[PDB]
Amino acid sequence: VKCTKARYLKKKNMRTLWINRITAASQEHGLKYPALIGNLVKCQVELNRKVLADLAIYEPKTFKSLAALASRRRHEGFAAALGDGKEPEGIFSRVVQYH
Amino acid sequence: SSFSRAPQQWATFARIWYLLDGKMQPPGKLAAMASIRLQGLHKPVYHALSDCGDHVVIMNTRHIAFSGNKWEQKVYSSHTGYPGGFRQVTAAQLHLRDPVAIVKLAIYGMLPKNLHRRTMMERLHLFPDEYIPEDILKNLVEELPQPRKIPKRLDEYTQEEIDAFPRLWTPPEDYRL
Amino acid sequence: MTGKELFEMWKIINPMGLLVEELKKRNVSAPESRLTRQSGGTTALPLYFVGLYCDKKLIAEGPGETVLVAEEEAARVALRKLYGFTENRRPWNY
Amino acid sequence: GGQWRLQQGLAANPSGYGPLTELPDWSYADGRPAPPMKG
Amino acid sequence: KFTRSRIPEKVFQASPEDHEKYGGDPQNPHKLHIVTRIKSTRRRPYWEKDIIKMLGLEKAHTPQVHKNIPSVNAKLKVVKHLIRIKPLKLPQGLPAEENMSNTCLKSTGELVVQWHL
Amino acid sequence: TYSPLPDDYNCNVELALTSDGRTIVCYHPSVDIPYEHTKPIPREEGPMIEQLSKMFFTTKHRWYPHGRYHRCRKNLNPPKDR
Amino acid sequence: GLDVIRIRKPFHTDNPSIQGQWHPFTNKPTTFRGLRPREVQ
Amino acid sequence: GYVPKTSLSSPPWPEVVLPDPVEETRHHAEVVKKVNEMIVTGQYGRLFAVVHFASRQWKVTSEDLILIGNELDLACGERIRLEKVLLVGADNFTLLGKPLLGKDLVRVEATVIEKTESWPRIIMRFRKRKNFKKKRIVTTPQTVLRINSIEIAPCL
Amino acid sequence: IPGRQWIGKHRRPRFVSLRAKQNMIRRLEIEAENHYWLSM
Amino acid sequence: TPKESPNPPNPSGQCPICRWNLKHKYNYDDVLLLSQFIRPHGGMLPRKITGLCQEEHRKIEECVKMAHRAGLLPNHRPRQLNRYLTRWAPGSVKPIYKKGPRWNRVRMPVGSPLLRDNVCYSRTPWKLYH
RNA sequence: AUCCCAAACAUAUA
RNA sequence: CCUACUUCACAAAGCGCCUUCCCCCGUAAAUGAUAUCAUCUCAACUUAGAUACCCACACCCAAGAACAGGGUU
């Protein structure tokens, strides 16, 4: 019964491990984890957590690239919010659509 | 990169020393930073079963600054098994008795509550004042930032900002002061 | 030879000798070694990073638990980089 | 994050409708496509 | 005692402020509803369960379409606290038979024919 | 070298969009560690546990041996990863 | 022919890095002449 | 519109400002041209591709193996190509899609090496005092794919 | 505290967090939209 | 001696803090704002002479107190354990020997209650009682 | 009425 | 602990002897503010505020249930 009921915990706490690892790398590059994954999903880079953690380990400066991209998007978002009126959108903030 | 196998493993899992000033910092924030660093939750390689803890060295723990009135109010409780041994002591008293115990107990509370807590608390080093043994000082690598920004007082406010800050009211011609 | 690194297949000893031999065959000075990163110098689990240099430019670095093993493995690293047999090489094209 | 995805007119769940799930996931080497997914 | 609920009809006299708030169109009112369940049938009385079995809403977050007749409105008006109903706007007319197997639905509430994968 | 975030702690990475907008290209070269930032090479069964406890900084518990039951269950020929 | 017993990793990436595996000094700066903190000379 | 300097009148976060859009576009054009000449010449080495094949995301490189938890309707040793590549990277550059990358800028091949069924896994349900004791054996089917090559192409 | 601590005259009243209130408001706004789309 | 500068942005306000668009823009760390409302011996001036309002007078008084007990005006003594945001004077606060269970805890005050309407920048507000 | 009982933290863009 | 007294008499004992400590954080006194006088301070501000003990086979013993411990010059 434990061998059965443990598969759901397997998924649960492996996702927790990946979230912790990504938080470690993100803190290495100056960005908390909420900001990273949120503002990265706000650029249609639909990358899941397993690959992000595996990139934190086995590919450090492509992770640096993704973190820099996230910080860029965050700054563009804060600039847009600071826009008190009508403002052109940022350069990465643009949304690509598909039918 | 492109190292050999064993040197690559040693590079990955090697453990880095960390100094951490403590002057005019609240014990809890030092405790939080030390808690994350001791158990390895700053390495992307983290895992509980890997034991990737990294050493930590706090200094100036005598100049810890609790917030509010926590010196008078916060009380730490201990009890030897012998009757009447329920003793509990304020923070000021425990600071005078042994001025490395507030930060020690904070880091002890935050760490995970398992049979790895003792290893992590052994890899913590706490030194009350700026002194530090040389065989430790020549192991250090990094100096983590001070969490609380120490608000400087009038004494180090140079005249440029004293007179640049606008005078905001007009006392009458005559006054005692 | 897939996955097998170079020097697990080409069993040599005394790498820095072959390094200076190759760099002299290319008419360049014997490379000068320095200490890049150091963590835990006194304890029994140290990490020393030794970087070989070629007249103010760096051609490899390597980790070890002694400055000497670090020297040796940084030599192995540089020797790999020169011979175009690193781990980032283009995979064989089948 | 999926509230932002909705205020931009996307499926809140990237495994919903979008490029990621609609398009085929493989093709024979020469180029002739392959029978679609049962999903 | 607990009972059913009779909502006074004054709750359904939409104001002009409501009209300009949501995608209002009082005249030329919309034809269909797309309805999705967002709460559990359990911990809720039995007639709510029966209604949520009558309107096809078994699985949550699975959208189902219905008319805007006052009968179906009188059914929805007692499970309204378990459903999100959005108009099914049709910017281009409802599909023809040849291009019907190649249609799809967008989260904004629109049914669209131009869905090439 | 653009530094909204101070891309100097580690190295510098440059971000850009292809002309249309459906691909993002980032350029990250391996920044090399400078020379003038470098340094030159410099050219008995209870006390046993206590000394190993101070040298490796682990606590005393793990150093005592374990019984036969906890040493026939150990795997002699474990699988080799990679 | 391999035994049908459990499979631990869904992958066997024999060269699992292209960009340099992580050691604690990636992303950590360097200082003038290699001064560990609080030093003088 | 003036405030004397104070610890909380200003925002603690350091207010950055974005670059000018036209110069920003010129910079972006320059760097993409640089990466384009790098790809055209042959600077790169090995390549890693983050791929979305058939359930979920795999980080894949040449020569390696990937275990999929379902059948794929393909004879043994029958070459295949994996569309839906959402990251491809080398030593010096990496390209991310938004979300995906066109079928011309990245080409990921593959082959099927073996088709197996997983080890016999157990589903047992149990409840106390109710004589509820269910047992079942499940054998999921699996197929293992050898990734062969990842060819990037200059089309940017 | 007499027993069955969640009831009695000296019961312990639970606190209303901010995110619970935010969830209440989310459901309630959805209800307002339902009221509209059943109003025609 | 202190005077009035020729550029008060918002002249004729509710109080000389409102005459500088400050009413919710000072903490205890603002040493000079307090120093402009202090005698040479630590205790601050009557509100009549300065012209301050009731609430802002109270706020500057409390800020002066917390600034003293933090050790931020050492040249204002009337002639060691280091704190900040010391609400109550340390001579009249007792230890918390009996802190209740989860649901009736007694917690150590921090900050001052006259600074709730300050600007807030982290989304989780100031947590006065700790 | 055996022994207080989570360690902490007023502010980095929800 | 056994010198005497006392049951007893290589000793164990009491009804017989000798030793027993450490200022231990509690109080008020002044100057003085918002509230210019006035007021001990949920304002700042000067003061009445522990040791000691232990540490390197066999035969007897003031050490011992066995094992331990002191002695064998």
From Swiss-Prot, chain D:
Name of this chain's protein: Large ribosomal subunit protein mL52
Family under the similarity heading: Belongs to the mitochondrion-specific ribosomal protein mL52 family.
Localization terms from the record: Mitochondrion
Coiled coil: none
Subunit details: Component of the mitochondrial large ribosomal subunit (mt-LSU). Mature mammalian 55S mitochondrial ribosomes consist of a small (28S) and a large (39S) subunit. The 28S small subunit contains a 12S ribosomal RNA (12S mt-rRNA) and 30 different proteins. The 39S large subunit contains a 16S rRNA (16S mt-rRNA), a copy of mitochondrial valine transfer RNA (mt-tRNA(Val)), which plays an integral structural role, and 52 different proteins. mL52 connects the central protuberance to the body of the ribosome.
The organism's place on the tree of life at top rank: Eukaryota
Organism (species): Homo sapiens
Swiss-Prot record, chain F:
Record key words, sorted: Mitochondrion, Ribonucleoprotein, Ribosomal protein, Transit peptide
Main location: mitochondrion
GO BP annotations listed: mitochondrial translation; translation
Annotated GO MF terms: RNA binding; structural constituent of ribosome
GO cellular component: mitochondrial inner membrane; mitochondrial large ribosomal subunit; mitochondrial small ribosomal subunit; mitochondrion; plasma membrane
Complex and partners: Component of the mitochondrial large ribosomal subunit (mt-LSU). Mature mammalian 55S mitochondrial ribosomes consist of a small (28S) and a large (39S) subunit. The 28S small subunit contains a 12S ribosomal RNA (12S mt-rRNA) and 30 different proteins. The 39S large subunit contains a 16S rRNA (16S mt-rRNA), a copy of mitochondrial valine transfer RNA (mt-tRNA(Val)), which plays an integral structural role, and 52 different proteins.
Protein name (Swiss-Prot/TrEMBL): Large ribosomal subunit protein mL42
Interval of the full protein contained in this chain: 35 to 142 of 142
UniProtKB/Swiss-Prot annotation, chain H:
Keywords annotated in UniProt: Mitochondrion, Ribonucleoprotein, Ribosomal protein, Transit peptide
GO MF, one example: structural constituent of ribosome
Amino-acid biosynthesis is among the record's keywords: no
Gene Ontology process terms (BP): mitochondrial translation
GO CC terms: mitochondrial inner membrane; mitochondrial large ribosomal subunit; mitochondrion
Compartmental location: Mitochondrion
Similarity comment: family membership: Belongs to the bacterial ribosomal protein bL21 family.
Complexes and interactors: Component of the mitochondrial large ribosomal subunit (mt-LSU). Mature mammalian 55S mitochondrial ribosomes consist of a small (28S) and a large (39S) subunit. The 28S small subunit contains a 12S ribosomal RNA (12S mt-rRNA) and 30 different proteins. The 39S large subunit contains a 16S rRNA (16S mt-rRNA), a copy of mitochondrial valine transfer RNA (mt-tRNA(Val)), which plays an integral structural role, and 52 different proteins.
Annotated protein name in UniProt: Large ribosomal subunit protein bL21m
Gene: MRPL21
Swiss-Prot record, chain J:
Name under which the protein is recorded: Large ribosomal subunit protein mL66
GO CC term (a single one): mitochondrial inner membrane
Keyword DNA repair in annotation: no
Gene Ontology terms for molecular function: small ribosomal subunit rRNA binding; structural constituent of ribosome
Organism, scientific name: Homo sapiens
Localization: Mitochondrion
Misc. comment: There are 3 mitochondrial isoforms of bS18 in mammalia, localizing to 3 distinct sites in the mitoribosome. bS18m (bs18c) binds to the same site as bacterial bS18, mS40 (bS18b) binds to a novel location of the 28S small subunit, and mL66 (bS18a, this protein) binds to the 39S large subunit.
The keyword 4Fe-4S is annotated on this UniProt entry: no
SS bond partners: none
UniProt keyword annotations, A-Z: Mitochondrion, Ribonucleoprotein, Ribosomal protein, Transit peptide
Subunit structure of this chain's protein: Component of the mitochondrial large ribosomal subunit (mt-LSU). Mature mammalian 55S mitochondrial ribosomes consist of a small (28S) and a large (39S) subunit. The 28S small subunit contains a 12S ribosomal RNA (12S mt-rRNA) and 30 different proteins. The 39S large subunit contains a 16S rRNA (16S mt-rRNA), a copy of mitochondrial valine transfer RNA (mt-tRNA(Val)), which plays an integral structural role, and 52 different proteins. mL66 forms a zinc-binding site with uL10m.
Coiled coil ranges: none
Family: Belongs to the bacterial ribosomal protein bS18 family. Mitochondrion-specific ribosomal protein mL66 subfamily.
Any GO BP annotation: mitochondrial translation
